[PDB]
Design an enzyme around this catalytic site. Structure first.
Site, PDB file in Angstrom:
ATOM      1  N   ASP A  25       0.777  -1.229   0.000  1.00  0.00           N
ATOM      2  CA  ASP A  25       0.000   0.000   0.000  1.00  0.00           C
ATOM      3  C   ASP A  25       0.818   1.294   0.000  1.00  0.00           C
ATOM      4  OD1 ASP A  25      -1.961   1.849   0.266  1.00  0.00           O
ATOM      5  OD2 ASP A  25      -2.935   0.919   1.986  1.00  0.00           O
ATOM      6  N   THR A  26       1.081   1.863  -1.174  1.00  0.00           N
ATOM      7  CA  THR A  26       1.846   3.111  -1.255  1.00  0.00           C
ATOM      8  C   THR A  26       1.094   4.239  -0.533  1.00  0.00           C
ATOM      9  OG1 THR A  26       0.895   3.571  -3.470  1.00  0.00           O
ATOM     10  CG2 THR A  26       3.034   2.443  -3.412  1.00  0.00           C
ATOM     11  N   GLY A  27      -0.196   4.015  -0.290  1.00  0.00           N
ATOM     12  CA  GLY A  27      -1.012   4.995   0.395  1.00  0.00           C
ATOM     13  C   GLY A  27      -1.105   4.834   1.907  1.00  0.00           C
TER      14      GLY A  27
HETATM   15  C1  LIG Z   1      -3.060   1.485   6.751  1.00  0.00           C
HETATM   16  C2  LIG Z   1      -3.056   2.903   7.365  1.00  0.00           C
HETATM   17  C3  LIG Z   1      -1.742   3.161   8.095  1.00  0.00           C
HETATM   18  C4  LIG Z   1      -4.248   3.105   8.319  1.00  0.00           C
HETATM   19  O1  LIG Z   1      -3.123   3.937   6.271  1.00  0.00           O
HETATM   20  C5  LIG Z   1      -4.164   4.056   5.385  1.00  0.00           C
HETATM   21  O2  LIG Z   1      -5.250   3.528   5.474  1.00  0.00           O
HETATM   22  N1  LIG Z   1      -3.778   4.877   4.371  1.00  0.00           N
HETATM   23  C6  LIG Z   1      -4.707   5.237   3.305  1.00  0.00           C
HETATM   24  C7  LIG Z   1      -4.381   4.477   2.018  1.00  0.00           C
HETATM   25  C8  LIG Z   1      -5.431   3.435   1.638  1.00  0.00           C
HETATM   26  N2  LIG Z   1      -5.141   2.127   2.216  1.00  0.00           N
HETATM   27  C9  LIG Z   1      -6.242   1.161   2.173  1.00  0.00           C
HETATM   28  C10 LIG Z   1      -6.233   0.311   3.444  1.00  0.00           C
HETATM   29  C11 LIG Z   1      -7.245  -0.793   3.434  1.00  0.00           C
HETATM   30  C12 LIG Z   1      -7.492  -1.518   2.273  1.00  0.00           C
HETATM   31  C13 LIG Z   1      -8.456  -2.526   2.256  1.00  0.00           C
HETATM   32  C14 LIG Z   1      -9.177  -2.811   3.406  1.00  0.00           C
HETATM   33  C15 LIG Z   1      -8.933  -2.091   4.573  1.00  0.00           C
HETATM   34  C16 LIG Z   1      -7.971  -1.091   4.577  1.00  0.00           C
HETATM   35  C17 LIG Z   1      -7.666   1.711   1.983  1.00  0.00           C
HETATM   36  O3  LIG Z   1      -8.191   2.413   2.847  1.00  0.00           O
HETATM   37  N3  LIG Z   1      -8.285   1.362   0.857  1.00  0.00           N
HETATM   38  C18 LIG Z   1      -9.649   1.774   0.526  1.00  0.00           C
HETATM   39  C19 LIG Z   1      -9.649   3.132  -0.184  1.00  0.00           C
HETATM   40  C20 LIG Z   1     -11.034   3.635  -0.588  1.00  0.00           C
HETATM   41  C21 LIG Z   1     -11.618   2.888  -1.788  1.00  0.00           C
HETATM   42  O4  LIG Z   1     -10.857   2.166  -2.467  1.00  0.00           O
HETATM   43  O5  LIG Z   1     -12.833   3.027  -2.064  1.00  0.00           O
HETATM   44  C22 LIG Z   1     -10.230   0.705  -0.395  1.00  0.00           C
HETATM   45  O6  LIG Z   1      -9.570   0.280  -1.338  1.00  0.00           O
HETATM   46  N4  LIG Z   1     -11.458   0.268  -0.130  1.00  0.00           N
HETATM   47  C23 LIG Z   1     -12.089  -0.746  -0.962  1.00  0.00           C
HETATM   48  C24 LIG Z   1     -11.937  -2.128  -0.307  1.00  0.00           C
HETATM   49  C25 LIG Z   1     -12.567  -2.236   1.057  1.00  0.00           C
HETATM   50  C26 LIG Z   1     -13.815  -2.817   1.216  1.00  0.00           C
HETATM   51  C27 LIG Z   1     -14.390  -2.933   2.483  1.00  0.00           C
HETATM   52  C28 LIG Z   1     -13.714  -2.461   3.607  1.00  0.00           C
HETATM   53  C29 LIG Z   1     -12.469  -1.877   3.461  1.00  0.00           C
HETATM   54  C30 LIG Z   1     -11.900  -1.765   2.188  1.00  0.00           C
HETATM   55  C31 LIG Z   1     -13.559  -0.468  -1.280  1.00  0.00           C
HETATM   56  N5  LIG Z   1     -14.078  -1.151  -2.294  1.00  0.00           N
HETATM   57  O7  LIG Z   1     -14.212   0.346  -0.629  1.00  0.00           O
HETATM   58  C32 LIG Z   1      -4.690   6.756   3.086  1.00  0.00           C
HETATM   59  C33 LIG Z   1      -5.030   7.539   4.321  1.00  0.00           C
HETATM   60  C34 LIG Z   1      -4.019   8.076   5.121  1.00  0.00           C
HETATM   61  C35 LIG Z   1      -4.322   8.729   6.313  1.00  0.00           C
HETATM   62  C36 LIG Z   1      -5.650   8.852   6.715  1.00  0.00           C
HETATM   63  C37 LIG Z   1      -6.670   8.324   5.924  1.00  0.00           C
HETATM   64  C38 LIG Z   1      -6.357   7.673   4.732  1.00  0.00           C
END
Ligand SMILES: CC(C)(C)OC(=O)N[C@H](CCN[C@@H](Cc1ccccc1)C(=O)N[C@@H](CCC(=O)O)C(=O)N[C@@H](Cc1ccccc1)C(N)=O)Cc1ccccc1
Lengths: 99, 99
Positions: A25-27
């Site tokens: 995760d680059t983010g």
């Molecule tokens: C891991 C830590 C340290 C908490 O940092 C971040 O989350 N950084 C974020 C990058 C994005 N990383 C992933 C982490 C992740 C991935 C998957 C599951 C749980 C967590 C993310 O949120 N991704 C979201 C971004 C929003 C989006 O894509 O719509 C995502 O891909 N979500 C998908 C997958 C998903 C489904 C259900 C629940 C959770 C995730 C989605 N379809 O909604 C940016 C950020 C920084 C600071 C404050 C807020 C936000």
């Protein structure tokens, strides 16, 4: 390796004698792994992402093997849906973005 | 460009005639931008991140300029802390991970 982004950038990691898959995760500033059996001490900590904040446990200087590349750094453990390898560990395996 | 990860991978995007900075997020399936003035129709939608879910508005076939590279795709608008460019748009500007 080079990795296109058509599919989630999932890799195999070895941490604490166990094998798991994590997302590069680059983010993410930090590396957050789901509940797991880890050795050592730790400190409480709240961290945020989209959706709000979650309470995890901080473990420093933990060894981790990402695609064969070893690295040592802080890892956070808590209620995350997917294992996330953040920039803290990504900088350590010489991972860059390219386009 | 090549991008190391010592600093957040922040880029300049032009969307809807306005200039903004967004984070290139290999760990986001979708592109989520904070509240902004966008033209067109939209549909409600809930999406998940690390701390839970958030309600955003879906806008399809939106034009976006990321570091000079044009792309057209779905963009989500809502209460996100930072603008996130997901894989949907990252695949379009030929962005890869490397290490
Ligand atoms: C891991 C830590 C340290 C908490 O940092 C971040 O989350 N950084 C974020 C990058 C994005 N990383 C992933 C982490 C992740 C991935 C998957 C599951 C749980 C967590 C993310 O949120 N991704 C979201 C971004 C929003 C989006 O894509 O719509 C995502 O891909 N979500 C998908 C997958 C998903 C489904 C259900 C629940 C959770 C995730 C989605 N379809 O909604 C940016 C950020 C920084 C600071 C404050 C807020 C936000």
């Amino acid at each position: 390796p080079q990795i296109t982004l058509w599919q989630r950038p999932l890799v195999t990691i070895k941490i604490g004698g166990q094998l798991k898959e994590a997302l590069l995760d680059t983010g993410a500033d930090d590396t957050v792994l789901e509940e797991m059996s880890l050795p050592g001490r730790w400190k409480p900590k709240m961290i945020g992402g989209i959706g709000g904040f979650i309470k995890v446990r901080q473990y420093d200087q933990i060894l981790i093997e990402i695609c064969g590349h070893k690295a040592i750094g802080t890892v956070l453990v808590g209620p995350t849906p997917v294992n996330i390898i953040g920039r803290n560990l990504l900088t350590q395996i010489g991972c860059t973005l390219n386009f």
